[PDB]
Amino acid sequence: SGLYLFVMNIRSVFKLDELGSEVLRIAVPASLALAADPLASLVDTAFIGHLGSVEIAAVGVSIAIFNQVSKVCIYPLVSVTTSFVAEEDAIISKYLEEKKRYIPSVTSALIVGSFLGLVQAVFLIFSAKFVLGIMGVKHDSPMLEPAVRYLTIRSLGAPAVLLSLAMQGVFRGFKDTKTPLYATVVGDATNIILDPILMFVCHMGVTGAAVAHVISQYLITMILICRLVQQVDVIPPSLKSLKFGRFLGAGFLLLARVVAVTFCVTLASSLAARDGPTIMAAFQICLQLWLATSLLADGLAVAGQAVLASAFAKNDHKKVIAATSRVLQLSIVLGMGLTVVLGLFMKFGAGVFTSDADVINVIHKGIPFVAGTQTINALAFVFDGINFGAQDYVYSAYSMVGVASISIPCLVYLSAHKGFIGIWVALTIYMSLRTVASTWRMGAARGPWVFLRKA
């Protein structure tokens, strides 16, 4: 059994050797870029918070529209490209040939991102009134006008947004998270700078905030594409040299997988909402705490994926094994550390979020789940990176379908029976199912780990 990989070289968890330096070198910048958007967006939130009462709820619903539409079109387009570029960049016979280099995954991802980005752009421009009526914004309500304005304008950035996300998948294929991190920082500072200039000095309000974000997003796309064309070639030499069927298929497998994962969390929230606003608010806080702390290991999972995708591309079973073990031990360490920190923060900083004693008390009731399964969470996310470095997409798809089929009845039953604590028990069952699904793929020496029966 492949479970021994969890403890192999455990005297070298923190060693800054080639593997340790590389994993740290790939993982830390990605985490930083994932952490830079929330802070820059919170600065944006502040600027809009000084506009008016309708504008936040107007812009906020407009933003809620974008963020989910993207997450559908983000996770596949980036997790497929990080592996399909890291594969083709690791066997492209690269040598002292001067004529840069064409990678079909790089060209394929840019096309898919550009198409989806303009498609989302047009769609959210024309169905703005429609989606907003869907989004609980009444048509007679005052929110609808600035929401439509901000939505329609910010949808100009949708092409650049999805294109730069494809390019982050590309640059992750090259094991370069610094380039997306630099681009993200640059755009976010520019947007934090452009927000007061346009919203307030130009008297544009929600139009100003949207123009600030769109200009900054197109700057980030520009930065990424200049660095990307200087490193490799993005034009295909012939129109037949584009690997597309394989590309879109992994994307749709990962898209179906994400739909299931997000729907499990969607049901939990829609079930907590049926338990009074106190349970409503407390579960929402717990859930953001739960998931946000999992988002740290996301750079670690990218490093593991890129390294394993490059290594599986070169028949290098020895580094595959070392890197798998390394990121796995790092993930469990981070999970336990986040367990400690998040539990402590929840008990003594609930009052940072809410001024309600009831909400804080329910938050304190739920601390064990949100804090306990943090090691399960880190393992679940890092194994996704690992099994994506193994490029096991059909298993991911059908395994999450099964985890949801087991977890969704758990949610419904446990929630209606024991409310807040029952939803959290169900979510623990689901996360334990997730972790066990991914770990079985590796440890059982089945699929992309069949070679383990020979080591």
Numbering used by the authors: 56 to 510
What did the authors write?
HvAACT1, belonging to the MATE family, transports citrate from the root cells to the rhizosphere, where it chelates toxic Al ions externally, thereby conferring plants’ Al tolerance. While most structurally characterized MATE proteins transport cationic or aromatic substrates, HvAACT1 is unique in transporting anionic substrates. Our structure-based mutagenesis work identifies the citrate recognition and proton binding sites in HvAACT1, which are physically separated but functionally conjugated.
Here, we present the crystal structure of HvAACT1, a citrate MATE transporter from barley (Hordeum vulgare), in its outward-facing conformation at 3.2 Å resolution. Removing these regions (Δ1-56, Δ153-199) and introducing five-point mutations—C351A, C388L, T495V to enhance thermostability, along with R105H, R456S to reduce surface entropy—successfully enabled crystallization of a modified construct, hereinafter referred to as HvAACT1cryst. Functional assays in Xenopus oocytes confirmed that HvAACT1cryst retains citrate efflux activity comparable to the wild type, suggesting that the truncated N-terminal and L2-3 loop regions are not essential for citrate transport. The crystal structure of HvAACT1cryst adopts a typical V-shaped outward-facing conformation, similar to the previously reported MATE transporters. These lobes make tight contacts on the intracellular side, sealing the transporter’s internal cavity from the cytoplasm for approximately 15 Å. Conversely, the N-lobe cavity is primarily negatively charged, owning to a cluster of four Asp residues (D92TM1, D99TM1, D289TM5, and D296TM5). Despite 0.1 M citrate in the crystallization buffer, no electron density corresponding to citrate was detected. In the HvAACT1cryst structure, D99TM1 forms a carboxyl–carboxylate interaction with D296TM5 at a distance of 2.7 Å, similar to the D41TM1/D184TM5 pair in PfMATE.
